[PDB]
Paper text:
The noncanonical amino acid, para‐cyanophenylalanine ([name]), when incorporated into metalloproteins, functions as an infrared spectroscopic probe for the redox state of iron‐sulfur clusters, offering a strategy for determining electron occupancy in the electron transport chains of complex metalloenzymes. We also obtained high‐resolution crystal structures of [name]‐labeled proteins in both the oxidized and reduced states, demonstrating that site‐specific placement of [name] caused minimal structural perturbation, and giving a precise location for the [name] side chain in each protein. In the multicenter hydrogenase, DdHydAB, the nitrile group of [name] is 12 and 13 Å from the [4Fe–4S] proximal cluster and the [4Fe–4S]H subcluster of the H‐cluster, respectively; the fact that spectroscopic changes are observed at this distance confirm that this functional group has long‐range sensitivity to redox changes. These investigations lay the foundation for employing site‐specifically incorporated [name] to probe the redox state of FeS cluster‐containing proteins by IR spectroscopy.
We first selected spinach [name] (FdI) and incorporated [name] close to the [2Fe–2S] cluster. Mutation of Tyr in position 37 (Y37) gave protein variants with equivalent UV–visible spectra and cluster reduction potentials to the WT FdI, while variants at other sites gave abnormal spectral features. Therefore, site 37 was selected for site‐specific replacement with [name], to generate the FdI variant ‘Y37CNF’. The IR spectra of Y37CNF FdI in the as‐isolated state in solution show a low‐intensity but clear nitrile stretching band at 2236.2 cm−1 (top) close to that of free [name] measured in the same buffer solution (2237 cm−1). At −5 mV, the spectrum exactly resembled the as‐isolated protein, while at −650 mV, a redshift of 1.7 cm−1 was observed in the band from [name]. Crystal structures of WT FdI and variant Y37CNF were solved at near‐atomic resolution for both oxidized and reduced states of the protein. Site‐specific replacement of tyrosine with [name] causes a small change in conformation of the side chain relative to the native enzyme.
Numbering used by the authors: -7 to 97
Write the structure that this text describes.
């Protein structure tokens, strides 16, 4: 049977930062953090490899692929936690950024 998904897409990312919102378009094959930086948004990061808490966020709406991350356990992923350096949007998304301090490990 046929495939439904587009080869390419642009997804609107809304970041809810601690004090404001900023928005930009993100290609389907660009990580949230990278697309934000391309727009000059200064988001926290360190390893950029999915294995730490620096870039943590929380997904409020939409859907993300986070198969490339490793530090968050499956339950944390199910509970909405995001490593923005290793997440791809598969829809328009709203993500709260700067959420490192809310994690445990
Ligand atoms: S910066 Fe370490 S997991 Fe994203």
């Amino acid at each position: 049977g046929p495939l439904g998904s587009p080869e390419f897409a642009a997804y609107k990312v809304t970041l809810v930062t601690p004090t404001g919102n900023v928005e930009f378009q993100c290609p389907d094959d660009v990580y949230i953090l990278d697309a934000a930086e391309e727009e000059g948004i200064d988001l926290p990061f360190s390893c950029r490899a999915g294995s730490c808490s620096s870039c943590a966020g929380k997904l409020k709406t939409g859907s993300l692929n986070q198969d490339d991350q490793s530090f968050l356990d499956d339950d944390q992923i199910d509970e909405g936690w995001v490593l923005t350096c290793a997440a791809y949007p598969v829809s328009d998304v709203t993500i709260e950024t700067h959420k490192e301090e809310e994690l445990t490990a």
